[PDB]
Structures are given as structure tokens and as C-alpha cells.
Design a protein around this ligand. Structure first.
Ligand SMILES: *c1cc(-c2ncccc2C)n2ncc(C3CCCCC3)c2n1
Ligand SMILES: *c1cc(-c2ncccc2C)n2ncc(C3CCCCC3)c2n1
Lengths: 305, 305
């Protein structure tokens, strides 16, 4: 039936995007109820970027220094505050398009959809994973700050990411909606080490199960392995160690296909050691780690919102 | 800055999805103004599927045999007609969420976003290409019929595809919004040959330009080629012949990067003949053909809607 990197429908989030301007800087904001959330770096200028004193810069700002526009609707700013690396602008009108929502701090390896925006307007939507080193490999240009990542559960939008910056390496960094960065990153123009990234093993296994469900079974072999033997191979190829928790999360896919999790690990061990010999799996010539076990079940079961 | 398979924001299309039921069959419909569009195969049963007589089956139906539900809003069917392979149900209420829209018949090689739906509810969004053989490699399950493909140009949605069926090969087939199938396909349960597919050469070249823009330049070599020499290699590797029209469409990317189109063709020639030697381009170990030159410019220039 096919398997695609599927994003959540973005409608509920499109209704929340606004443009925030402070002086010469314009970026995106998220309008939920009577609060607009945006990166605090909206208040810093070219001369400040290397190490802004956000407390001092914010003290020089008043409510009328923040211009918020939702499409053509001009919002009135009646309060401002900084929470970690986000600015929270209280507005005098609750967003009539506010969906049911939660703010969540996702774990590394989990996925979410990103609605990339510029000037408070949607440009596109794509699915991505929070890397183990807390970076995201997105697609973002200047002005994309304030774009958000989210997941949907029936009618509820769980916002998990707000884009802040590109690192000199071309990867992306941001915060949860309480303004806490994912990873060791700071909101200043400096070279910052992201550190060693690894492949999300439980996601690669989930994608191998998605492949079996779709008829791509060439990689199934006559071997089995142990959790400890597989983890020796995982450490060698910079893959995350597999735990019993990960095995338990793969239970539904193991049940649907009749392939024991450790048998799928022995197939993955052979692909790591021998490569793919010019073959493809679900249209890919690499081992894909951007689908969680939940993503595979949602896509293979047609879960709606 | 990264490069992702980016879909259009789906909000404008989510507001148009409805559920259409006729007897025991339920699928998706598209509600635009006072007309609901859906696959005509909504009127066929398990005993008819092999070769339905759609004219006879439709004659046995009346307006009250079609139930249309938009969320929880029950629409009143006041007219029905068949146009090619689509059914057009006239309803007594114009959709208040109707966007500015056009119906278009896309050319093979062009791309569009698909909003996959079940029971009139959105499940996900993804970008895909109309293959040269007029199939689509989507992600669709039973009940996905009536889901649509579209492109957006500022505030206008151009609908180009309505999903009808999966072929026994696992690829997907459908129609434009006037009910004409793309390709030689018919709406019946039979084995149908899609014929030889080829790789969309102009799209592979556009993606190589996107790679150069993002700093992946390892594949740039010291060779050049001619349009005729490159076409000898294209025929050998089942790639579409490149024409001057394709060279002209790549003009903006050639200008932005300073790499002449024929020089990029000589790089592509070397990748086809020598493979990628275990290297990747924009995170892929295969040559990607699902980005048009327009898609690359939109993504690299941050075009909003
Ligand atoms: C907003 C957006 C971006 C950005 N994201 C992706 C690609 C390019 C760019 C420029 N940003 N990158 C860095 C920053 C900085 C500005 C100075 C304060 C710290 C964050 C940024 N903002
Ligand atoms: C609707 C949806 C699908 C479908 N799409 C993707 C994956 C699985 C399935 C079943 N359909 N496939 C075939 C058809 C037929 C039904 C009988 C008439 C011709 C079309 C279909 N409808």
C-alpha cells in the first residue's frame, strides 16, 4: 500500500500563526488563547547577536514595541514576559481559531510535523525526528524562527518545538513551548557543538516492520540474535542501544507480522554488517530512522484526526 | 539549510473533505461550492467490482440514496450526475469554507500534495509526483478513495488528483477532478498494466541543483556533455530524454549556482555510470526525482501561501 513520510494535517496549526515584529526584526509567533509565543531573539539586533543580554534588551521594550499581526488582524499587546528563551505576549483578543492543545517536551527519537512559516504565513509541512543529539534536520531559511513542530491526537494538538536557529553546521535547534532549548544550545550567534549523533534503532526496526507489512521482505534472514549480541553491533555502527522498553514498544508490530523482535534485530545486524548490496527497502537505499513504532501503526492502520 | 519533501499546508483542503455513503460503501468526497465530487465507484458493490455497468447502477440510484456528511453537518443532495469516472452530487448548501480553486490536469513528472483521508477525516499529508507512466507511489489504505492531490498558488488551490484505486502492483491510480483517469486505467477490479516507468530527468537535475545550493557539491566533476550524448546515457538508464524546454526550465537554478545545465548533466552522467560509491546527496543514497525545478525554487526561496 505504500509508505511515505507523512505529516499531520496542518489546518489546526495554520490558524495559530501570526507575524511578530519588534524594531527591525520580524519572525513567526504562535497565538493560542490570548497569548502569542515567539523566540525571545526577536528583540536582538545585528550588534547584539554574538551574546545578547536578553534581560537588559527586554527592559528597554514596552508592550507597544511589539507589533502582532494575524493575517490582516492587528492584535493589541497588553503584557509581555520572558519565560526561558521564549517571549509571551499577552494580547487583548483570544484566538477564535485556538484548537484543543497541550505543550509537551518530546524525547529524542520521537517525531513531529513542522509547519514552516515566513512572515506569519505557511510555506509547507514536513515530518522530522528529534535527533538523539537534540538537533533537527529540517528545511528552514532566514525568517523561519517561531515556526512550530507538533503532533495531533484526534482533536488535540501537542506542540513540542519552536524553531530558533540554524547552527553553523546547517542543522536546526529550538525549544519546547516553555522556552527551554532541546540540547545544550544557546540563543546567540556562536559556533556550538551538537556532539555525536546516533541512529534511532527502535525507529529503524519499526520501519523494517512497515517494509514487511508492505511486501518488502528480502532482508528477512535465517538468523536470530540476543539483545546483548545485537547491542555489540549497535555500538560498532553508532546505533542507540536497544532496551526491553524498545522491544515492548515494538510488540504490536511483532504481533501483526509474526516476526519476533530479536529475529528483526538479526536482519538489521546483517544489513549493518553487509550493507544493502544495491537493493532498496520502501524506496530507500539507506536505513530509515524517522518513523517511530507509533508512526508505523498510525500509517498502516489509517488513524484519523 | 536543509531540504525536505515538503507538502503544501493542508488547511484549505481539510475544510472541503466530506464523507459520502451510498448503500454499504463509504468513501471521501470533496465539497466545493454546492457540489460534492467523489469516485463513481461509490455506487458499486462486491458482486459488481469486476466490471460494473456504471450507467445501469447509477440509474437505480436517487438523490436520497447518497448520504453526505461534512463533519457532523448533514448535507441535502438535490442532484446527481456522472462526469467520466466521478460522481457530482449537487447539495443545497454552498461550502462556507470553499477556498479559491481551479481544477487542473497535471502533466507526468509534476508534483502535488496528497491529503490522505478516511471517513471524510484527514489522516496525513505528503508530497508525491505523477509518474511518467501515470501512476502515483502514494500511501493509501482501503477507504482512502476520494482523497485529493493539489498544489497551492498564494490563495488558490489547484486540485489535480482524486484517488480511485490501488492496482495489484501496490501503486495508485486516479483521475483529474473532471473524472478522467490519468493513464490507461479503468475503475474496475482487474489486473491492469501500467507499463514502463522512467525516471524524471529534469527533476533529478533540479534536485542536484538543490544539493549544490545546500553545500553538497562532491558530485560536481571536470566533465561536460552534449544534450545528444547525455540522452544516449538517459535512454540506457531508463531516464526521460532531456529537451531544450527542460534546459530552459532549469535556467533559474543554473543562474543561481553558476553551473551550466550541460555541466550538471555531465555530473548526472557520471553518477548513473559509476553509482554513488556509498555516498549520499541531501541525505539520500538514490537519485531523487520527486522535486520539480519549481519545487526547488519555492523551497530555497521560502515562498508562502
Ligand atoms: C531565526 C531563524 C534562523 C534561521 N533558521 C534557519 C536557517 C537560517 C536562519 C538564519 N536563525 N538562525 C540563527 C538565528 C539567531 C539570530 C540571533 C540570535 C540567536 C538566533 C535565527 N533566527
Ligand atoms: C477505494 C480505495 C482503494 C484502495 N486504495 C489504496 C489501497 C487499497 C485500496 C483498496 N481502492 N482500491 C481499489 C478500489 C476499487 C473498488 C472497486 C471499483 C474500482 C476501484 C478502491 N476504492
Amino acid at each position: 500500500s505504500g509508505f511515505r513520510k507523512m505529516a499531520f494535517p496542518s489546518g489546526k496549526v495554520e490558524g495559530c500563526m501570526v507575524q511578530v515584529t519588534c524594531g527591525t526584526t520580524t519572525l513567526n509567533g504562535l497565538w493560542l488563547d490570548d497569548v502569542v509565543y515567539c523566540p525571545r531573539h526577536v528583540i536582538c539586533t545585528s550588534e547584539d547577536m554574538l551574546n545578547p543580554n536578553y534581560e537588559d534588551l527586554l527592559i528597554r521594550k514596552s508592550n507597544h514595541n511589539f507589533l502582532v499581526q494575524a493575517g490582516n488582524v492587528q492584535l493589541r499587546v497588553i503584557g509581555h514576559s520572558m519565560q526561558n528563551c521564549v517571549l509571551k505576549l499577552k494580547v487583548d483578543t483570544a484566538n477564535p481559531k485556538t484548537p484543543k492543545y497541550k505543550f509537551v517536551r518530546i524525547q529524542p527519537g520521537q517525531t513531529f510535523s513542522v509547519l514552516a512559516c515566513y512572515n506569519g504565513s505557511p510555506s509547507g509541512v514536513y515530518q522530522c525526528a528529534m535527533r538523539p543529539n537534540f538537533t533537527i534536520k529540517g528545511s528552514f531559511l532566514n525568517g523561519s524562527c517561531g515556526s512550530v513542530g507538533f503532533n495531533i491526537d484526534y482533536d488535540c494538538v501537542s506542540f513540542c518545538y519552536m524553531h530558533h536557529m540554524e547552527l553553523p553546521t546547517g542543522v536546526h535547534a529550538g525549544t519546547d513551548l516553555e522556552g527551554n532549548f532541546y540540547g545544550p544550545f544557546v540563543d546567540r550567534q556562536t559556533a556550538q557543538a551538537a556532539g555525536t549523533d546516533t541512529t534511532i534503532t527502535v525507529n529503524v526496526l519499526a520501519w523494517l516492520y512497515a517494509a514487511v507489512i508492505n511486501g518488502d521482505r528480502w532482508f528477512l534472514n535465517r538468523f536470530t540474535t540476543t539483545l546483548n549480541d545485537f547491542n555489540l553491533v549497535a555500538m560498532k555502527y553508532n546505533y542507540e542501544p536497544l532496551t526491553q522498553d524498545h522491544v515492548d514498544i515494538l510488540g504490536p508490530l511483532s504481533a501483526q507480522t509474526g516476526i519476533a523482535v530479536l529475529d528483526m534485530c538479526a536482519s538489521l545486524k546483517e544489513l549493518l554488517q553487509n550493507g544493502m548490496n544495491g537493493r532498496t527497502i520502501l524506496g530507500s537505499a539507506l536505513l530509515e530512522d524517522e518513523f517511530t513504532p507509533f508512526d508505523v501503526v498510525r500509517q498502516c492502520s489509517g488513524v484519523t484526526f
